[PDB]
């Protein structure tokens, strides 16, 4: 997150970190046993880390739980990044409370102008690189279809949307992928890709979670 702020400890209680000896992606808790993240963060040997703040220090409210299943979308394309979504099953259910909590799925899509909350332990610099200890936050609006399409000619499918600042200075970045985009209390987006971090006229591009609700529900029910 470039141009964001320190969230505060456990103020984003559905924020997970994905860990295999180190932090490599984020994700969102959607119930006590399942996490949404990016298909492009698929790997083996994933540990889910819940109610983290400082990811380098044990501080008190962490639950470390191994993934027992990672289900990348069947129609995921690595070249286009279309259908960039993955479901992770926890080996055992998380204990849920105020500092570890699931985030609701959308019941409809959100519109252009809506403010959203994007979080993560990704890089904080737009040129050069710098990774934080504690969780970072950013308030950013959804952009019109046309402005998104006009920012990235031919790359925006119907399962993507942009959010951010056309002027630069404020964006998600490397390390934030898999992470949540929360708008009026719903998980609408997933940190996916963009052209640099915080570049003028290159806002971020997020997996449009409202198109996957039924899939998510049915995948969960059958696994």
């Amino acid at each position: 997150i470039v141009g964001g702020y320190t969230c505060g400890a456990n103020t984003v209680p559905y924020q997970v970190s994905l860990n295999s000896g180190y932090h490599f992606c984020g994700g969102s808790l959607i119930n006590s046993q399942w996490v949404v993240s990016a298909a492009h963060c698929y790997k083996s040997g994933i540990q889910v880390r819940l109610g983290e703040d400082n990811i380098n220090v044990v501080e008190g409210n962490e639950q470390f739980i191994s993934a027992s299943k990672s289900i990348v979308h069947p129609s995921y394309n690595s070249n286009t990044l279309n259908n960039d979504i993955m479901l992770i099953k926890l080996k055992s259910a998380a204990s849920l409370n105020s500092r570890v909590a699931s985030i609701s799925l959308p019941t409809s899509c959100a519109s252009a102008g809506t403010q959203c909350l994007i979080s993560g332990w990704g890089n904080t610099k737009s040129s050069g690189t710098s990774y934080p200890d504690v969780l970072k936050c950013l308030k950013a609006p959804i952009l019109s279809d046309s402005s998104c399409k006009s920012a990235y000619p031919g790359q925006i499918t119907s399962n993507m949307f942009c959010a951010g600042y056309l002027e630069g200075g404020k964006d998600s970045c490397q390390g934030d992928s898999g992470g949540p985009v929360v708008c009026s209390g719903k998980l609408q987006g997933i940190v996916s890709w963009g052209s640099g971090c915080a570049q003028k006229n290159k806002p971020g591009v997020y997996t449009k979670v409202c198109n996957y609700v039924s899939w998510i529900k049915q995948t969960i029910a059958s696994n």
Partner: peptide
């Protein structure tokens, strides 16, 4: 391909993607 690898939000996953192109 590689430019899109860089677009995904140097780490190993990027390097893999990079190698894979």
């Amino acid at each position: 391909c590689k430019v899109m690898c860089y677009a995904q939000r140097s780490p190993e996953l990027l390097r893999r993607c990079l190698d894979n192109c």
